[PDB]
Structures are given as structure tokens and as C-alpha cells.
Amino acid sequence: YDRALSIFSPDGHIFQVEYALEAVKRGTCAVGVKGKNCVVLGCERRSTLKLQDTRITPSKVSKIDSHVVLSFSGLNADSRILIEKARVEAQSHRLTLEDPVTVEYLTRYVAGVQQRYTQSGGVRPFGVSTLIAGFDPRDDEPKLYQTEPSGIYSSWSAQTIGRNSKTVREFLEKNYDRKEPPATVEECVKLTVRSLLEVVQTGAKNIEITVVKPDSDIVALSSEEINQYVTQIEQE
């Protein structure tokens, strides 16, 4: 095979990238908030339908390291390819360089797959837009990045990707200071929940929160834990 699928557009664009970004619109919604001591990635699960087990359904934030997590927006099929690939890079980086992955290394890696499939004829880039966050070893500094199916990456202090990310981002502008992230763990988790309470709703059955704190601490907070923060937001 070599029959081109990436064809140059008369906008100075590539047809497959514009479509990938439409796919991220259809996708799920991942939100990222960096505190002064935490990163929080909360995501939308699709499980509105009744009689659906939630023990065995793949999680929308998958841990690639012990303090670097990978979350996604877009198609549910294509996201898994970057996740399995990121884990191989993690074990390769520990073999040949020693020391856990940094967020930055993985941000470049995930872009190199999208970028490689954008330029070549025979492969289309994945319709998956990602947030890579976490800590780097011997640093209590939270790192928050976004890569997109172009193969371009940019830093953020807080971010949102996926459906009606415009609406949520506008709410997060006023309740977030670049100079002053949330200095509390609690207020950071409450901030991500409020952003999710615009689009996601459904109580807490489509709301997830993973909090990552330094010292290799990834914690997953269920529907039950998340309710606790919701009521505090309602009173507020």
C-alpha cells in the first residue's frame, strides 16, 4: 500500500487532521487543572444506559507510570493504541535511561505517532486528543500538557478537551489564576467537578476524578467519593 489518504487541502491544511478534530468533538470530555501541589484529571464516562457494570469497563484515564497518567478525548477505539504504545515507551525509558518517564518525554512520543501518520500516505492520524499530566521524579512541580492529533503540543496551566470545551474553559478562566493555582487539594478537585457539572452531569455516574500527588501517588476516586465534593459545591 501507499495510496495517499493525507492529501493537502486548499486551506494549507490536511484533510485527515480536520476530520480527526471533528472526531474529538464527538468524543468524551477530559478536564485538566494544575494546583500548586497536584494535578487533577477528570473525565466523562459514557454509561447512561442501565444494566451496565462499571467494574470491568475500561477507564478513561489509564496509568502509564506511577505518577504520570494519560487521558483522552475522541474515539474509544483509537485511544487504546496510544495507551499500549505509551506503556512500551515507559518500560524502554526505564531500561535504557533509568528513572521514571517524565511527562515531557511522553508528550513528544505521543505527538510523534500522530505526526508520522499525518505526513504519510497509507496511515491516517488517530482522532484522539490527549492530556498528559503528572510529576517528574524528584519534583513536586505539576506538569500539564496537551497533544492533539496534528502532532503539535503546547503547555497549559489548566485545560479541557472534547465536547463543549469552549463553555467549560470560559467557566475555568474566572475561577483560576495563572499566578495562583488552587493551593488546596480540595479546591482543585472541586474546580474540576464544577467544570464537569456543566456538560457531563448524570449525578456522578459519568463523573470521574483521578488525583495525582507527588511521591508516586495516583489515586482513583469513585462515584461515591465524588458525591461528597458535589454537595459542597451546591452549598457554595
Partner: protein, 244 residues
């Protein structure tokens, strides 16, 4: 012309959605109902064949239920032909994991693997995806019984009860009103059959058009024993539920 005759079917549409993946879901609504219900003592898989004739031999027919390994079987809804290739890739992969780790493959990994193959067809080669939907009954000791559906895009969704194929919506409303979280395999066997009786594809539901299989933890010592019933053992349960 080696690009004049290519149409590009590994491309997204302006929506972000693959043409061939959308069409595949249609062609799988052609194939008959297939049901998975997860009790707690097992998993019931029950499928009604999509062809029947009276000179057709249905007593040896395998066209829905296939064993990938001794704890994992699938129901097929789509083309038999398309599914077969994946079924034998599955057998190789499950046994490969047993060969190297001396441990049976968890349900998660196998499901993820077949999904990657489906995505791989749209990712490259200009190949069409095999339009298959599987309902996986699987056991592992880490999550107990696990129930899954995979779709021809290559994605998997956990379930408690689920249906694919013909009359997918109807079947699902019946499961929602009748399901308990404390159901036995017995309760789930009766629920599966009664649901197939309202989503039947002739006017009568018959034992010889049913494949029925369970995976039961009743089998001693903690083992899971898959039993694929004979149509003459499916007949027995058809009299239990009083269709007959």
C-alpha cells in the same frame, strides 16, 4: 490507474466517523439476536440462528457459539465468515498467553486484542474491517465473571446484560425491567429465553434454532465448566419456560 479505482474507505468522513464502520453496524442488524446475561454464578449466552430450513442440519450447526478457550466462549452476530478469522486468531492468542505464563488469559486482554485487529483494518492497508460483534462470556478469578460486547470499530464496553443483532432495542427493555443483582444462573436462563421469545425471528421459537450455552461455577472444586447444550437439552429448558 492504481489510485483511480481507489475510493478511500480508511478515511474519516467530515463527522469524524468511518464510513465502513457505520455500515458494518447495519449489516450486523441482519444477523439474529444474540444475548449475554451475567448472573453471579455464571454467564448465560443464548443466540438464535439467523438461518433455518428443515432440510438444514441444525443439530451439528455451529454458527453462533464458539470456544476460544476453556473459560471463554463468544456469541457471534454478524457474518459467520467474517467472525471465523477472528475466532482462530483468538485461539492462537489465548493459548500463546497460556504457553508463556502457564496461566489462562484474563478476559480483558483477549477482548482488547481482537478490538486492536478491527481498528488495525481502518488504520492501514485500505482494508475493510470485519463486521463482527461478539458477546464475550469469560471467567477470570480477578473480576469473577466478566461480560463484554465489542463492536466492529474495535471498542469494548462492560455490561451486566446486553444484546446485539436483530431487535436489539426490544431485547434490552426486557432485560432492564426483569434484572436483579442477585440473580442465579437459573433465573438468567429463564430471562434469556423469554427475551428471545419476544425478539423471535419466526413466529415460533424452537429448540433446534437455538444455541444455548452456559459457564457455571457449580462444577466442583471451584472450576468453571462450560456446557454447550444439545438442542435436545435446550428442548428441556424450553419446556421449563413453558414456551412449549
Amino acid at each position: 490507474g492504481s489510485r483511480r479505482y481507489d475510493s478511500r474507505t480508511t478515511i474519516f468522513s467530515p463527522e469524524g466517523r468511518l464510513y465502513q464502520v457505520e455500515y458494518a453496524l447495519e449489516s450486523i442488524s441482519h444477523a439474529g439476536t444474540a444475548i449475554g446475561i451475567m448472573a453471579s454464578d455464571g454467564i448465560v449466552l443464548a443466540a438464535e440462528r439467523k438461518v433455518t430450513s428443515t432440510l438444514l442440519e441444525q443439530d451439528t450447526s455451529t454458527e453462533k457459539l464458539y470456544k476460544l478457550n476453556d473459560k471463554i466462549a463468544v456469541a457471534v452476530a454478524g457474518l459467520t465468515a467474517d467472525a471465523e478469522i477472528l475466532i482462530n486468531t483468538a485461539r492462537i492468542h489465548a493459548q500463546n498467553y497460556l504457553k508463556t505464563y502457564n496461566e489462562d488469559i484474563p478476559v480483558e486482554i483477549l477482548v482488547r486484542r481482537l478490538s486492536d485487529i478491527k481498528q488495525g483494518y481502518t488504520q492501514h492497508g485500505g482494508l475493510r474491517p470485519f463486521g463482527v460483534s461478539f458477546i464475550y462470556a469469560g471467567y477470570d478469578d480477578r473480576y469473577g465473571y466478566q461480560l463484554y460486547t465489542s463492536n466492529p470499530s474495535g471498542n469494548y464496553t462492560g455490561w451486566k446484560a446486553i444484546s446485539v443483532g436483530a431487535n436489539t432495542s426490544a431485547a434490552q427493555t426486557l432485560l432492564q425491567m426483569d434484572y436483579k443483582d442477585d440473580m442465579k444462573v437459573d433465573d438468567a436462563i429463564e430471562l434469556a429465553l423469554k427475551t428471545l421469545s419476544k425478539t423471535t425471528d419466526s413466529s415460533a421459537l424452537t429448540y433446534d434454532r437455538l444455541e444455548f450455552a452456559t459457564i457455571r461455577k457449580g462444577a466442583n472444586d471451584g472450576e468453571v465448566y462450560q456446557k454447550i447444550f444439545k438442542p435436545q437439552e435446550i428442548k428441556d429448558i424450553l419446556v421449563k419456560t413453558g414456551i412449549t
